[PDB]
Enzyme design. Structure first.
Site, PDB file in Angstrom:
ATOM      1  N   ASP A 190       0.822  -1.224   0.000  1.00 57.12           N
ATOM      2  CA  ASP A 190       0.000   0.000   0.000  1.00 57.12           C
ATOM      3  C   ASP A 190       0.847   1.261   0.000  1.00 57.12           C
ATOM      4  O   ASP A 190       0.653   2.089   0.860  1.00 57.12           O
ATOM      5  CB  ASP A 190      -0.923   0.016   1.231  1.00 57.12           C
ATOM      6  CG  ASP A 190      -1.806  -1.214   1.316  1.00 57.12           C
ATOM      7  OD1 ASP A 190      -2.241  -1.716   0.257  1.00 57.12           O
ATOM      8  OD2 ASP A 190      -2.032  -1.684   2.432  1.00 57.12           O
TER       9      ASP A 190
ATOM     10  N   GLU B 292     -11.270  -0.074  -4.042  1.00 57.64           N
ATOM     11  CA  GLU B 292     -10.703   0.353  -2.760  1.00 57.64           C
ATOM     12  C   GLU B 292      -9.535   1.283  -3.055  1.00 57.64           C
ATOM     13  O   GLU B 292      -9.316   1.643  -4.223  1.00 57.64           O
ATOM     14  CB  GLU B 292     -10.253  -0.877  -1.963  1.00 57.64           C
ATOM     15  CG  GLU B 292      -9.086  -1.606  -2.635  1.00 57.64           C
ATOM     16  CD  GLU B 292      -8.635  -2.805  -1.869  1.00 57.64           C
ATOM     17  OE1 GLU B 292      -8.674  -2.709  -0.630  1.00 57.64           O
ATOM     18  OE2 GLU B 292      -8.264  -3.834  -2.503  1.00 57.64           O
TER      19      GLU B 292
HETATM   20  O1  LIG Z   1      -4.882  -1.925   2.878  1.00 54.54           O
HETATM   21  C1  LIG Z   1      -5.150  -3.071   2.050  1.00 54.54           C
HETATM   22  C2  LIG Z   1      -6.659  -3.317   1.745  1.00 54.54           C
HETATM   23  O2  LIG Z   1      -7.293  -2.159   1.162  1.00 54.54           O
HETATM   24  C3  LIG Z   1      -6.912  -4.585   0.876  1.00 54.54           C
HETATM   25  O3  LIG Z   1      -8.163  -5.192   1.274  1.00 54.54           O
HETATM   26  C4  LIG Z   1      -8.948  -6.140   0.431  1.00 54.54           C
HETATM   27  C5  LIG Z   1      -9.610  -6.929   1.573  1.00 54.54           C
HETATM   28  O4  LIG Z   1     -10.420  -8.071   1.166  1.00 54.54           O
HETATM   29  C6  LIG Z   1      -9.771  -8.990   0.213  1.00 54.54           C
HETATM   30  O5  LIG Z   1     -10.696  -9.999  -0.277  1.00 54.54           O
HETATM   31  C7  LIG Z   1      -9.197  -8.265  -1.013  1.00 54.54           C
HETATM   32  O6  LIG Z   1      -8.496  -9.224  -1.835  1.00 54.54           O
HETATM   33  C8  LIG Z   1      -8.294  -7.075  -0.627  1.00 54.54           C
HETATM   34  O7  LIG Z   1      -8.036  -6.341  -1.814  1.00 54.54           O
HETATM   35  O8  LIG Z   1      -5.862  -5.532   1.108  1.00 54.54           O
HETATM   36  C9  LIG Z   1      -5.448  -5.489   2.519  1.00 54.54           C
HETATM   37  C10 LIG Z   1      -4.605  -4.248   2.792  1.00 54.54           C
HETATM   38  O9  LIG Z   1      -3.316  -4.458   2.278  1.00 54.54           O
END
Ligand SMILES: O[C@@H]1[C@@H](O)[C@H](O[C@@H]2CO[C@@H](O)[C@H](O)[C@H]2O)OC[C@H]1O
Ligand SMILES: O[C@@H]1[C@@H](O)[C@H](O[C@@H]2CO[C@@H](O)[C@H](O)[C@H]2O)OC[C@H]1O
Ligand SMILES: O[C@@H]1[C@@H](O)[C@H](O[C@@H]2CO[C@@H](O)[C@H](O)[C@H]2O)OC[C@H]1O
Ligand SMILES: [Ca+2]
Ligand SMILES: [Ca+2]
Ligand SMILES: [Ca+2]
Lengths: 533, 533, 533
Positions: C13, C185
Site C-alpha cells: 500500500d 478500494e
Molecule cells: O490496505 C489493504 C486493503 O485495502 C486490501 O483489502 C482487500 C480486503 O479483502 C480482500 O478480499 C481483497 O483481496 C483485498 O483487496 O488488502 C489489505 C490491505 O493491504
C-alpha cells in the site's frame, strides 16, 4: 476355559448355529471376496474355517461396491434338513440412504455348493430367518428411514417367507421400535418356553453398542423389554479390554447350556491418555467373542454383569482342538491359495492371480491402483494379532513408474501403507514407501529411494507390527536386512480413525501388483509369511 | 451462417470426422448410458444424432462407476474402409490415480453394430488413433504420473498399433511434454505439408483451458510450438460469453477449407459480481463449438484472434438442415425410447424400464435411490437451453415412504433436486420437494406437503427453467397448475459448483421411480415434454 | 536505472508524497509495532527509513488485534506547511464485517512527535485526504456493505473535512461505484488539467489486482473511466516476475515527470507447475514497486504497456545514495534497537525487552507463547531477500518445558517455525525444532532432541534460506555448525498459503523468549545477524 476373542482380527456380526453337537459361526465380510466366513467347532473354544459360501458371481457381485459396503451381518440357520444363509449386498453406505439387498441361499451341507440366491426384500440390513414351531418361516430385518427429520432406524419389520413360492408373502409389519438407545438393528427371533424372544443390537457398533432383548407370546408383539436391559454392553465399563460388546446371537447347546456370541473391539494400549475422551483405536477391527448365559424369571442373564468377561466357563463337553490350517511360511505349494487369503470385491481369475504360471510362486499380473474399487491384483490376509511379523519375497522388473509390486498394510482404498518396488527415470528400479491417509498420499522416502541392483532376482519385504507402531524392512539376499527409517502408527489402519463412519472391516496385510500402463507386467511371489510374536 | 454452440447442453470433447462430404462429431458421455454420441452434418452448421455406439455390456460396463468416470473424450476416425472409435472407461477420478482403460471398436457404418472392444493400454486418457500415409497406424494418449512430487500430466505418449496382431507393438515413447500451461491432454495428430502437427488441450478444462499446437517432420518429435500459442483459449477474454475454449479437433473440408471444433462453457449471467473473482457457473456443462482456421508460415490460426467467436462463416457448400428428431410432447407410443433419453451407467431391460407393459406409457419399476451408483430406474434427457419447461404425467401408488416417483433435475448422485410422489403415515399419498447438495438432503416442503386426493389417477409434474432460477409446479388435471413455494438456483446443477472437481457432465431432467422396500412397485409416465421458451 | 521492487519484503500500500525535491513513501504495517514506515529519497531509486509515526498507545493501541488487522493502507500528504497522515486500525478481518476506525495525525516534520489522533469516520478502510486548489479538504475512503446478497465493495465515499472543527462536515456521497472488476478500494484524488482524476485499486490484492483510474470535471462526478483501463495490472501477464500489480499512488516530480508506485508480489520459483492453475506463493509479502507514466489525451499511461516493468528509467536528477542503516552483525552495543526491528501489536518496555540489563546483549524476559495476540517477547525483522542467512547467539537456562528461547521464522500466530532451547524432564536443557501450520503444531525432532552440555554458555542458532526451501543449523562454539536434518518450505510462510485470506503481511525472522510459568526467566542474545546470500 475359554479366552475371548475366540475369532481374532476382522470377524463381526457372529451368527451361531447348532446342528446336533456341531457348532457353526457365520461372520460378515463386507467388500472382501468370497462372501461370508463359516467357522465350525465341537467345544466352542477351538474354531476352524470350513466354508466360504458366496463364491460365484451369480451369488455375490461386488464390483465398484463402496468400502464397507457388500456383505453386512449374515444369518446362518438350519432347518428341514438344510442350512439357510441370509445376507445383504449393501450398495450405499453414506448419506440419507443405505441401499442394499437381502438374499437367501441354501445348502444340504456346510461346505457344499450353495444355491443361487432368492431375492427377499430391500427394506433394510440385518436380515434373519425365523423357523417357527408350526413349520412357517419369517424374515426379520431393520426398516430404513431416509427422511431429514427422522432417525433412520424405524424399528424391526417382519413378513412371512413362503418356501414353496420362494418369496415373502402377506404384508410387512413393524413389531418393535427399540428402546431409547435406538439404532435398533440385528434382529433375531427365538421361540423359548412360552415366548417369542426378539434379540436386537442397539446404540450402534461403536462404544455405545448393546444387545437388547425383548419377548412376547405373540410373534407380532407388542414385545416387552428385559427388565434389566441391556442384556450385554461395554459402555459402562471403560477399563474392560473388550469394548463395543453387542450384535449378539444365542446358542442353546446339546448339554442344556446357554451362550451368547457377540462382536467386540479391542482398543490399542492408550495408557496415560484420558479414559473417556476417546475410548480407542481398534486395528484388528471387530472380533467375535462368547459369553455364558443363565435364566432368571423367563429372562437370560449374561454371567457376571451385562458387561463382557474376558474368560468364561465353556459347555460341558470334551475339548477338541484342530490342526493348523496354514503354513507360517506359505511357499505357494498347493494349486489353490490358502483360505485365509481374500481378494477385494471380485474373484481373481488365472489371468490375474495364478499358481500355474511359475511353479511354487503366486504370480500377480498388474491391474489398477490401491485406490480402485474395481480390479486390483491384491491377495491379502487379516491382521489377527497385535504383535506379528509378515514377509514376502518377490521378483519384479518395472519398466515405468506406472508399475509397482509390494507388501501392503491395508484398511480400505483410501487408507493403507506399502513398501513397494517401482521404477525411476534416473535411479531405474527402486524400493520406496508409500502411504495413503483419507486419499492423501505421502512418499516418505522421496529423493532417497533405494536403488535395486540389476543382478538381484529377488527382493525380500517385511513388516514388523508391535501394537501401536510398525516398521518395514528389506533384504536383497534373504539374510541381511535393513530397516527403512520410518515408524508407522497402527491406529491409522483402524475402524475408529476412518472419518466416514462406514468403517466395518479391519487391517489386512498382503501382496499387490499394479500395472498402470496396461502392459500386463507381473510379479512372482515366492512365499508369504505370517507369524505371531 | 453458423452460431455457437452447435451441440448445446452436455457435449464435451468433440472429435470430428470427415468422410468425403459427410461430417461426424463424437462427444464424451461419462456415466451416461449408452456410450458416446455421434452427430452428422453436411454443412458443419446443422447437426443430427446418428449413432450411440457403445450399447452392449461387452463394450461398456459402468456399474459402480464414479460420477464423471466412465467414457471420457472419444476419438472417431475413418480409414481403410471403416470407422475406428477409441474410448476410455475411467474408474478412478479423485486422488493421485486416474485408473482407466483404452479400447478400440470398429464399424463399416456409423450406426452399425460396432465390434467388441480390442484392448489397447491404460497409460492415460485422451486416446487418439492416427492413420499415416504409409498405411501404418499409431495411438497417442496422455501419460499419467501419480507421484506426489510431480505434475500428473507427463506428456503425450505414442506407440504403433498393429492392425494384424490387434495390439500395440514396439515400445512406447513420449513425443511431447507440453508448454508451461501444462495439464497436456487430448492429443490429435495430423500430417500436413511435410509436417506432423500435434494438437493438445492444455491448462485444464476449466477457465484456463486452451488448445495448443506444435509441429515436427519426425513423428517422434521434437515438436516446435506455434509461435503465437495458444491456438485457442478464452482465458484472457473474461467477457467472451464463450468460456473454457480448448479440447479441439481439426477438419480439412472437401472444399479446401479448415475448421476447428472445441468444447466451451457458457456461464450464467453475472452482473453485480467481480469480473475475475469467480468466472461463472455452467448448468449446460461443456458444449461444442466451431471456429474457422486460416494458415500462415506453416501454422494455423483461428480467424478472429485466439478467443472463440460467437458466430462464424460456414463452409462453401449448400445448406442442409434436418427435421426435428423428437416430439416436444413424447406420448410413449414408440417401440423404443427416443434417442435423447439416457440412463445411468447401465442399460435398463424390460424388468426396469418398459414401453410394453402399458401401451402409451413408460413404466419404471422402483429400484435404488438417487444417490446410488449402481441401479437406478431413471430416464433423463439433457438441459439444452437456459430457458425451458419440462413436464410429465404419472400414476403412482406408494404404500411406504421407501417408495417414490417424480421429476428430477440431476447433476450427479449427490447433486440433484426432485418433485416427487411418496407416502406419509398420516397424509397418505403426498407431493414433496427433495434436494441433495453434496450428499446433504433437504425437504423444503416439510411438513406442509401436498395431499394427493385418493381419487386422482395422474399427477402432472412440471419444471420451468429461467436461466438463473427454476421452479417446480403441479396439477391434478393438466389445466390448473399450482406453483410450489420454493425458488431453485440453477448454478447448483453446474460443473463449477461441485466441490470434487470430477464434474465433467451437465444438468439432466428426467423421470425416476424408487422402491427401497423391494416390492417392485412401479410408476407409469403417460408422457414427457421438453420445450424451449 | 531503477530496479523493482524499490522496497523489498513486507511493504504494501505505498502512499508516495512529494515536498519540493524530497520524496516520501509510507506503507502499511498491520499488527507490527510501531505503526507505518516512511522512506525518503531524492532520486526515487535509493530509499532510507526516516519515520515510524505511530509509536504511542494514544495513537495506536493494537493489543488483541487479529493477524493482518491493525494498520491497513495509510495516506501521507503535505499541505499548508505540514504533513498529514491518515490511517485505519482494523479490528475485524474475517466474516461479513470489516470493523475499523480511520484517524488523522499531523506533524510539521516527517520524523517528529506526530499529533494525537483526530477520529474521522468508520465506514471503510483505505482513507485518503485530498487538498483542493481552493484550499478546501475532502476525505475519500471505500464504502463497506456487510449484507448477504450484496458485494461488500459499495464504492468510494467522499466527504469534506474541516480543519477548524477537527472533523468531517456536510453530507457523505458516493462518487464512484467501480468497473466490472469490482473490489474497489484505495481511492486517491488528484487535480490535473481540466479534470479531477480518481485512482483506485480494483480486483483484490491477489492475482486479479489492478490500478483503475477515472476523471471528472466535477469533484462529485460522475467519473468516466480510462478508455484502456486498467491503468496497471499483472493479471494478463502470468509470466511477469512482478504479480498482483495494484494499489497505486501517483507522483508528479519537480522535474515535471510522472511516476506511479504500487504494491507487488513476487512468487517463489515455480518450474514444472501449470502456469495458471495457482500463480504462486510470496513469502516476501507485498512489496513496493514503481513505474513511469506518460500522458496522452488527458489520460496517464504506464510506460511499457499496462503491466509492471522490472526496470525503469528514473527522473533526471542526481543520484543520492544512502549508507547502510543496520549492521550485518548486530552486536547490540547500541542504546536503542535497530529500526528494522518490530514487535507484535504493542511496544515492549524494559521489563520485557532491554539492551541495558546485560551490556552487549539484547535481553528478553519471557512472556506468552508464539500463538498469542496479546504480549510476546518477540523482536523480529523482515525477510527482504529470497536467499539469506540470519543468525543469533543466545544464553538461556530454562528450568521447565514451559520456557523457550530461540530463532523464529514467523508469518502470524498460527504459522511459524523455530529452532529453540527448552527443558526436558530426563535430558535437561535441549535444542529442538517446532512448527505451527494453521495452529497445528509439530516437533520434527521428537525423541531426538540435541542435548546441550551444561558447560556450554552460548548456543548459536542459524537459518539459511534458499528460495523455495530453508534449513536450520546450530553450533556450541561458533566455528563448527551442524544442520538439523529437516528441510523446511518457504511457501508455508507466504500470503498465498494462508487459509483465512486475511494474509496481508510477509515473513519475519527474529528472536523470541517465552516464559509460560511466570518466573521472569530471560534469554540473553549476544548478536543478531542478517545477510543476503
Ligand atoms: O490496505 C489493504 C486493503 O485495502 C486490501 O483489502 C482487500 C480486503 O479483502 C480482500 O478480499 C481483497 O483481496 C483485498 O483487496 O488488502 C489489505 C490491505 O493491504
Ligand atoms: O452389518 C453390521 C451392522 O449391524 C452395522 O449397522 C450400523 C450401520 O450404520 C451406523 O449408523 C451404525 O454405527 C451401525 O451400527 O453396520 C456394521 C456391520 O457390522
Ligand atoms: O475427457 C476430458 C478430459 O480430457 C479432461 O481431463 C482433465 C482431468 O483432470 C482435471 O484435473 C482437469 O480439470 C481436466 O482438464 O477432463 C474433462 C473431460 O471431458
Ligand atoms: Ca515358493
Ligand atoms: Ca401416453
Ligand atoms: Ca554482543
Amino acid at each position: 476355559k475359554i479366552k475371548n476373542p475366540i475369532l481374532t482380527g476382522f470377524h463381526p456380526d457372529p451368527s451361531i448355529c447348532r446342528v446336533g453337537d456341531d457348532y457353526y459361526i457365520a461372520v460378515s465380510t463386507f467388500e472382501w471376496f468370497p462372501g461370508v466366513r463359516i467357522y465350525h467347532s465341537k467345544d466352542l473354544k477351538n474354531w476352524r474355517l470350513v466354508a466360504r459360501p458366496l463364491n460365484r458371481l451369480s451369488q455375490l457381485n461386488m464390483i465398484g461396491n463402496p468400502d464397507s459396503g457388500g456383505v453386512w451381518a449374515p444369518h446362518l440357520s438350519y432347518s428341514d434338513g438344510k442350512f439357510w444363509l441370509i445376507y445383504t449386498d449393501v450398495k450405499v453406505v453414506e448419506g440419507q440412504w443405505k441401499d442394499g439387498h437381502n438374499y437367501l441361499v441354501t445348502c444340504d451341507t456346510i461346505d457344499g455348493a450353495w444355491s443361487d440366491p432368492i431375492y427377499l426384500n430391500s427394506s433394510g440390513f440385518g436380515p434373519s430367518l425365523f423357523h417357527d414351531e408350526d413349520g412357517r418361516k419369517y424374515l426379520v430385518n431393520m426398516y430404513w428411514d431416509h427422511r431429514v427429520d427422522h432417525h433412520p432406524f424405524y424399528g424391526i419389520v417382519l413378513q412371512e417367507y413362503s418356501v414353496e413360492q420362494k418369496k415373502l408373502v402377506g404384508e410387512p409389519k413393524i413389531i418393535f421400535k427399540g428402546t431409547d438407545l435406538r439404532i435398533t438393528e440385528g434382529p433375531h427371533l427365538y421361540k423359548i418356553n412360552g415366548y417369542y424372544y426378539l434379540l436386537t443390537a442397539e446404540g450402534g457398533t461403536r462404544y455405545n453398542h448393546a444387545a437388547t432383548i425383548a419377548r412376547s407370546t405373540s410373534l407380532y408383539g407388542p414385545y416387552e423389554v428385559h427388565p434389566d436391559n441391556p442384556l450385554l454392553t461395554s459402555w459402562p465399563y471403560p477399563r474392560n479390554p473388550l469394548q463395543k460388546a453387542g450384535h449378539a446371537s444365542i446358542v442353546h447347546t446339546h448339554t442344556d447350556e446357554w451362550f451368547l456370541v457377540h462382536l467386540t473391539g479391542r482398543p490399542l494400549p492408550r495408557e496415560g491418555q484420558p479414559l473417556l475422551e476417546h475410548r480407542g483405536y481398534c486395528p484388528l477391527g471387530r472380533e467375535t467373542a462368547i459369553q455364558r448365559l443363565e435364566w432368571k424369571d423367563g429372562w437370560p442373564y449374561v454371567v457376571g454383569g451385562n458387561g463382557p468377561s474376558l474368560e468364561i466357563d465353556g459347555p460341558s463337553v470334551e475339548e477338541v482342538s484342530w490342526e493348523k490350517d496354514y503354513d507360517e511360511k506359505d511357499d505357494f505349494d498347493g494349486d489353490t491359495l490358502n483360505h485365509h487369503f481374500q481378494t477385494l470385491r471380485i474373484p481373481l481369475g488365472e489371468d490375474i492371480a495364478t499358481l500355474k504360471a511359475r511353479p511354487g510362486h503366486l504370480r500377480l499380473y498388474g491391474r489398477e491402483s490401491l485406490t480402485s474399487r474395481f480390479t486390483q491384483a491384491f491377495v491379502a490376509r487379516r491382521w489377527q494379532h497385535f504383535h506379528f511379523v509378515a514377509e514376502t519375497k518377490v521378483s519384479f522388473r518395472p519398466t515405468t513408474f506406472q508399475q509397482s509390486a509390494g507388501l501392503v498394510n491395508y484398511y480400505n482404498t483410501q487408507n493403507w501403507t506399502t513398501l513397494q518396488i517401482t521404477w525411476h527415470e534416473e535411479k531405474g528400479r527402486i524400493l520406496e514407501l508409500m502411504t495413503c491417509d483419507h486419499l492423501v498420499v505421502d512418499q516418505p522416502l522421496r529423493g532417497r529411494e533405494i536403488v535395486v541392483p540389476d543382478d538381484i532376482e529377488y527382493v525380500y519385504l517385511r513388516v514388523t507390527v508391535q501394537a501401536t507402531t510398525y516398521k518395514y524392512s528389506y533384504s536383497f539376499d534373504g539374510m541381511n536386512w535393513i530397516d527403512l527409517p520410518v515408524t508407522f502408527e497402527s491406529y491409522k489402519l483402524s475402524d475408529d480413525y476412518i472419518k466416514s463412519r462406514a468403517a466395518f472391516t479391519g487391517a489386512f496385510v498382503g501382496m499387490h501388483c499394479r500395472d498402470g500402463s496396461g502392459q500386463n507386467n507381473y510379479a512372482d511371489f515366492d512365499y508369504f509369511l505370517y507369524k505371531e510374536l
